[PDB]
Nucleic acid binder design. Structure first.
Ligand code: HEM
Ligand SMILES: CC(=O)N[C@@H]1[C@@H](O)[C@H](O)[C@@H](CO)O[C@H]1O
Ligand SMILES: CC(=O)N[C@@H]1[C@@H](O)[C@H](O)[C@@H](CO)O[C@H]1O
Lengths: 466, 79, 94, 107, 104, 98, 96, 80, 108, 94
DNA sequence: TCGAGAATCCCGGTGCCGAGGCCGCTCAATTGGTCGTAGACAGCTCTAGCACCGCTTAAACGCACGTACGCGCTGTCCCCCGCGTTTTAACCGCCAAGGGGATTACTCCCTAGTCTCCAGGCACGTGTCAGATATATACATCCGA
DNA sequence: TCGGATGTATATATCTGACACGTGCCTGGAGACTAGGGAGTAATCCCCTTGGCGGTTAAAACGCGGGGGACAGCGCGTACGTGCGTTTAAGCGGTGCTAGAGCTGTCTACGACCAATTGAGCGGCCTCGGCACCGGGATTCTCGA
């Protein structure tokens, strides 16, 4: 009853069936493996099935500290009283820290390279070892927390370990909130959807629902349409560095040895800052290394990410395209002409009409990645609606919001309002030349790169307690 | 020229209905005519001054727009 | 027969970015042009006053940014600032 | 010489940075105008135009129409708190008023 | 829930004082619409072959990807206004907010 | 012989003229009034058609806003009927007749 | 001895409409102004003239709003001013 | 930190007496405090913006005058 | 050369015509400023100042005081219709308010 | 300490012309100075807008007269206009 | 809660005029170089905003009481509403005129700019005289007897 | 409607601090030119503003029946003003300190200005379809029992 090796549609497994004349798989009996999400209350025939969000909905840097007591306790440094995060005891990135390794019964990080035998990286989330770049970001955030705790200890020798750790966790969570709501979200929703859905903060409303919607887990997957076909690494001169400056993405998935034994995370972050993403066009929805060549080494066939997304939307029991258009005050198409008007394309509308039969039958993921992107944004109006509403519920419903009174002092708030991701990169890596403001918008060296000695570091002087 | 009576009672009633008025007293029409006369006198005086400065004999829509703008009553759609 | 300049093609280009199928009428064109002129004049006047207050002879992106912050209400202003900043950055890149 | 590249394309805008600079230069505002002031002003004007155009197009689409008329622009402006505050002393011609009846006037 | 607290709990506990269990980790999702399953409560649309959805058959997800999503890789268009920083922060923000567990 | 109550046609007119955009004053009498008023300032004046329409739009918007404020004033006094004193109070608080 | 209600109220009206002195304690007003301005800047310094001007403007604004409130209360056939008169005055003024 | 209560009830009653008010209700005072806080918030925000643009650490009275003039509330006797 | 006669002395005004021209030229109002705008503006400013000062002096005399305090200026402004219209949105510091009591509130 | 200029001396001269036996305080002097500044700003701004609307690049006494007519209400304006005109006339005589 | 009459919604052809696309071309925007004056930076000076300290003491605070007012209910009638008929002129569609808005060519006079200098005006220092501050008086004015 | 009963404008001293004035000097306004471009003045074209006729008919007006709501009694509960005694920081006057506003000197770099080139946008001309248009069929919001 293992989905990785069985194709029978028996609970809790519901796979994807291969249509005739498939470009990759020539066998009809073969199927794409798939797992059904865990029901909230299994064994109940009256209550409607629903899924469980395994992490706290708030923007509290849960990817660095976790959302469970054993995981948060295991991520700390209990060998001293400085309130540091657990680090790597075997390898270092030119003297800099790395995430501790984790012991898994099925460790797939060893499958990518059988000679390196490098395990996965432990952090606040299970999927931290998804790609070398995600591992790089996790390393960056762990290093930033450690450095902040060290600086606070130097500035305030009277503070103990637990207070130092809690203060550093608070500052890191505030940093994640500031970065997400000041840089990322305006570049996701565009100015119009961001303004309409995330207006000026007033105060913590305790009646606002802070939970994550079921649609958000299948409407935030719009990022699957910017996954570039290759992984890029650069040297100190920001030039393609040998060996393998560009790697096929099917060979970098779930590979932590590319981080441990290839000079740490500096080349990976350098490539991240200096490689443009893939634009989303109505004819190029997803590259073939995620549509056809996803996870070769860890399982027995390549995976279809768009098919996985649509199948998950079907399994989660999400309403179709028309109902989610009916939420946001948007017209619901019924015929081919209405779909051609809404989706801004006629051939795409015809293909969707032939595949599904009604606009009500369209899946949320395919529909969301189908209509054209908003102006200055990377989502359609319905996806922008969903994401903006969810993030407004997350923000306005947070009592410990970094701008909420009683969490950070006013001087501390002005100290926090000066952070930036390039500053964290510079303070926690060997990279000297870093991208300009809005690191999410800069991709071409040296057009939008500066020597980062000019960026002011975080001022912890306001954190002194007398 | 008693053209102020040209704004009939049904016209004032229509303007009130657009403004959300359900019941109207009988003496409202004279008061509304006076208010309209005062407002029009102010705006037209400003617009006529604007036209006079331009040494023109015709009141243009730009003159009315500037006269309304000078009173904090900016009007869009005419320039 | 003069070449009466207006923000007609620019508003049309923005409209095709936002609503390619949707068109625009003559009166809506006039209203958009009037709004653009009004906001331009508001921001320019506020920036001029800011420059005069500090005995500065030039209008820079700082004066324009502060005028946008003063005039535009609420998050509008913030968003506008972001746009302007980004533009200048790009203009400095090339 | 090299091929001419318009400043709007350099800045990535559609509103004319060159014409905005010309308007600021002869607008009687300051003695000198910086090289980034027209870019900032053009970006802000384009952003505001995009906001109103998006709202008006949504209003027209909900009205089941293909073109935009002043009624749609008025509906867009008056239904938005920030845009209504910005255009608070502004009249949109042929735009009508928002439907609103007081509670006690109902039967 | 404690009457006073200066730091967030690990599980997001006690952020909302009137409803403690709401907003924490390992809690069920919220729904803005009722779930539209094949049977209404248990079967996803496409679980049983031949059962039409709203009167029309359920499309195969792999076929939908093949006909619509698929494109020749060489025709890739890079994003001239965003970098892979955008993608990576998006995935990190996902790992922050939401994660739907599935059985092994 | 079907007759509505005295408070139904008024509400129907309210809903009908709030969803429209047309000008609620007859154009010829309004133009004559505008010319008669402008005769106080200059004689033998000419008006552009756009000028008269702009004046009409401005006046109708002003009167609609004044009537909304007057309705609020009359409701404040626990009334439904619009009376002149409500107009005076609205104009006084607005700063017009203040 | 005792005065019937409304007598010393009229006496206060007559006595306070004559004097031009500020009718708010200066130290609590300084504290309130600094508390409000703290949310916009750190270690902000205020001139004496700055807080004095803020106090004069605030007192004039409150007095004018109270005149409008009294007129609204008179409209509803009443003598006592109520918060709804304040709200109506603000709405008709346009501040709301 | 609850300094808005420094605007005492006798002060508000004195302001209303200057405003020609003979009788006051008991719920007037909190409404007056809220209105005053809103007005002061707007004026102080504009003044602090004017100060920040000048790269100054102190808020001068001229910044307050500029803020009030921006709100359409010109004030005489302070600055120019 | 000749003795530097101020332009205001020729115009017969008490306000500085030269200073007014300097603030007109440096005020960012127009590319050019005529030679009659300073005199006109100075005359208008002097006339308005003279009127408000005359009314304020009358108010001070009615209060048996020698010096003018802001109360006299406020009484002068609020007792004149045109000055109240011109300064409708103007606040005078330490000027107080006009003494008015509603007829309903008067004893009866 | 650098020089700081104001209309205080001219205001005092006008007051002595009007009321020779009546003096002025310092707060009233500040009020008079602010009043002169505000009226100057209003008239100059209106004249600038008038010059711009006519595609002209000079502020003249006709623009100032129109500005006085537009700003000053009723009888005041009349008298003010006369005063202004008279001044210019004298400045044209010598 | 259900018929009658009426107002509005919403389908289906129609053609029509207004918005969108296309074609020249010209005036404005771009490219390439210099000048020097405005602004960024660094340094020194000395206001003045800031933070206790002690004493009055004017005022804020809280309470007891009762009188005036807000609130609600009742009754009248008359003023406002909605419909039927008739009339009045708003409106649409040519028909014609012509007065003024808009455009174009020349020039000349008024404004910007530069150089010198000298006197009005600003910052300083002072003393004396209106003005806020006590004190008793004669009114000024309110409440049952 | 008077006796006192509270409050206050007023006549008579009394310090006092701030305004009107004298003075030094310095920097900005005045006198005197020159250069150039903005607008003052005609002059022509057309367009769009005004007056008129005439047929349609949409709407304004006059009248009338009736009903509902605006306004004047009438009473009752309560809460807001008034007076009193206790408490508390407001205000004042000195005290010391140093943060930062303000002025000054260097230097450089960035925007104004000029000349050459070309293409972006604006006006004029088709052209077709979005929609305001006219029947006509549902759809129902309401009123009277
Ligand atoms: C770049 C390489 C990426 C890979 C290899 C990847 C892979 C995956 C996979 C395999 C899933 C589960 C599919 C399923 O439902 O069966 C998933 C879920 C998801 N992805 Fe991605 N993803 C990537 C990037 C992104 C980006 C850039 C975003 C958003 C900006 C994103 C948003 C999400 C979300 C919200 C989920 C739902 C969480 C869950 O179902 O557990 N992903 N991802
Ligand atoms: C498991 C862990 O984090 N161990 C660390 C160790 O690497 C480090 O050298 C030591 C210094 O005190 O602190 C502890
Ligand atoms: C193609 C590839 O992955 N080659 C790797 C190489 O880079 C690495 O150095 C070696 C030892 O770890 O293992 C193998």
């Amino acid at each position: 009853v293992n989905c990785e090796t069985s194709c029978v549609q028996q609970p809790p497994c519901f796979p994807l069936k291969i249509p005739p004349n498939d470009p990759r798989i020539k066998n009809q009996a073969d199927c794409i493996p798939f797992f059904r999400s865990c029901p909230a209350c299994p064994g109940s025939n009256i209550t409607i099935r629903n899924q469980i969000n395994a992490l706290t909905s708030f923007v509290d840097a849960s990817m660095v500290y976790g959302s469970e007591e054993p995981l948060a306790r295991n991520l700390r440094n209990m060998s001293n009283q400085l309130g540091l995060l657990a680090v790597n005891q075997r390898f270092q990135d030119n003297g800099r820290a790395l995430l501790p390794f984790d012991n898994l019964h099925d460790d797939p990080c060893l499958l990518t390279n059988r000679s390196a035998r490098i395990p996965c990286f432990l952090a606040g989330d299970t999927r931290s070892s998804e790609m070398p770049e995600l591992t790089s970001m996790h390393t960056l955030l762990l290093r930033e927390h450690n450095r902040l705790a060290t600086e606070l200890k130097s500035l305030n020798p009277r503070w103990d370990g637990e207070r130092l750790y809690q203060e550093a966790r608070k500052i890191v969570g505030a940093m994640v909130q500031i970065i997400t709501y000041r840089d990322y979200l305006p570049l996701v929703l565009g100015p119009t959807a961001m303004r309409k859905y995330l207006p000026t903060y007033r105060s913590y409303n305790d009646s606002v629902d802070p939970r994550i919607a079921n649609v958000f887990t299948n409407a935030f997957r719009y990022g699957h349409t910017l996954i570039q076909p290759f992984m890029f690494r650069l040297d100190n001169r920001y030039q393609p560095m040998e060996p393998n400056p560009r790697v096929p993405l099917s060979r970098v998935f779930f590979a932590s040895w590319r981080v441990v034994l290839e000079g740490g995370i500096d080349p990976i972050l350098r490539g991240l800052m200096a490689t443009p993403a893939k634009l989303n066009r109505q004819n190029q929805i997803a590259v073939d290394e995620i549509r056809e060549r996803l996870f070769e080494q860890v399982m027995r066939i390549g995976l279809d990410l768009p098919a996985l997304n649509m199948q998950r939307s079907r399994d989660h029991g999400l309403p179709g395209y028309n109902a989610w258009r009916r939420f946001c005050g948007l017209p619901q198409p019924e015929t081919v002409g209405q779909l051609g008007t809404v989706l801004r394309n006629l051939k795409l509308a015809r293909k969707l009409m032939e595949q599904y039969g009604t606009p009500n039958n369209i899946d949320i993921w395919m529909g969301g990645v189908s209509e054209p992107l908003k102006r200055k944004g990377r989502v359609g109006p319905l996806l922008a609606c969903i994401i903006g509403t969810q993030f407004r519920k997350l923000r306005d419903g947070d009592r410990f919001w970094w701008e909420n009174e009683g969490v950070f002092s006013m001087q501390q708030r002005q100290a926090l309002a000066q952070i930036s991701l390039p500053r964290i990169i510079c303070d926690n890596t060997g990279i000297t030349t870093v991208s300009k403001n809005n690191i999410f918008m800069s991709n071409s060296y040296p057009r939008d790169f500066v020597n980062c000695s000019t960026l002011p570091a975080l001022n912890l002087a306001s954190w002194r307690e007398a | 020229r008693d053209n102020i009576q040209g704004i009939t009672k049904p016209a004032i009633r229509r303007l009130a209905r657009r403004g959300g008025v359900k019941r109207i007293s009988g003496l409202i029409y004279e008061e509304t005519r006076g208010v309209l006369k005062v407002f029009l006198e102010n705006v037209i005086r400003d617009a006529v001054t604007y036209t006079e400065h331009a040494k023109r004999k015709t009141v243009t829509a730009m003159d009315v727009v500037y006269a309304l703008k000078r009173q904090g009553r900016t009007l869009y759609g005419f320039g | 027969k003069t070449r009466k300049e207006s923000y007609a093609i620019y508003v049309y280009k923005v409209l095709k970015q936002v609503h390619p199928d949707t068109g625009i009428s003559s009166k809506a064109m006039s209203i958009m042009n009037s709004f653009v002129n009004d906001v331009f004049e508001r921001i320019a006047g506020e920036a001029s006053r800011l420059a005069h207050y500090n005995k500065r002879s030039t209008i820079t992106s700082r004066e324009i940014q502060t005028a946008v912050r003063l005039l535009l209400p609420g998050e509008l202003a913030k968003h506008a600032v972001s746009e302007g900043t980004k533009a200048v950055t790009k203009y400095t890149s090339a | 010489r090299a091929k001419a590249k318009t400043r709007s394309s350099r800045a990535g805008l559609q509103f004319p940075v060159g014409r905005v600079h010309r308007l600021l230069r002869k607008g009687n505002y300051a003695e000198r105008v910086g090289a980034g002031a027209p870019v900032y002003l053009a970006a802000v004007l384009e952003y505001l135009t995009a906001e109103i155009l998006e709202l008006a197009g949504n209003a027209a689409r909900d009205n089941k129409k293909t073109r935009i008329i002043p009624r749609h622009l008025q509906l867009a402006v008056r239904n938005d708190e920030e845009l209504n505050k910005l255009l608070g002393r502004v009249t949109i011609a042929q735009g009508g008023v928002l439907p609103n009846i007081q509670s006690v006037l109902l039967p | 829930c404690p009457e006073q607290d200066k730091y967030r709990t690990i599980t997001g506990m006690c952020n909302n004082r009137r409803s403690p269990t709401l907003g924490a980790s390992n809690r069920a999702f919220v729904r803005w619409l009722p779930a539209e399953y094949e049977d209404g409560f248990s079967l996803p649309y496409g679980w049983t072959p031949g059962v039409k959805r709203n009167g029309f058959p359920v499309a195969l997800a792999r076929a939908v990807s093949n006909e619509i999503v698929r494109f020749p890789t060489d025709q890739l268009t890079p994003d001239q206004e965003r970098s892979l920083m955008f993608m990576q922060w998006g995935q990190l923000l996902d790992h922050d907010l939401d994660f739907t567990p599935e059985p092994a | 012989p079907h007759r509505y109550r005295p408070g139904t046609v008024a509400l129907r007119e309210i809903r009908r003229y709030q969803k429209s955009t047309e000008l609620l004053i007859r154009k010829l009498p309004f133009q004559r009034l505008v010319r008669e008023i402008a005769q106080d300032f200059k004689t033998d004046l000419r008006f552009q058609s756009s000028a008269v329409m702009a004046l009409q739009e401005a006046s109708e918007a002003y009167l609609v806003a004044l009537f909304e404020d007057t309705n609020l004033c009359a409701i404040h006094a626990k009334r439904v009927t619009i009376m002149p004193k409500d107009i005076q109070l609205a104009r006084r608080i607005r700063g017009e007749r203040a």
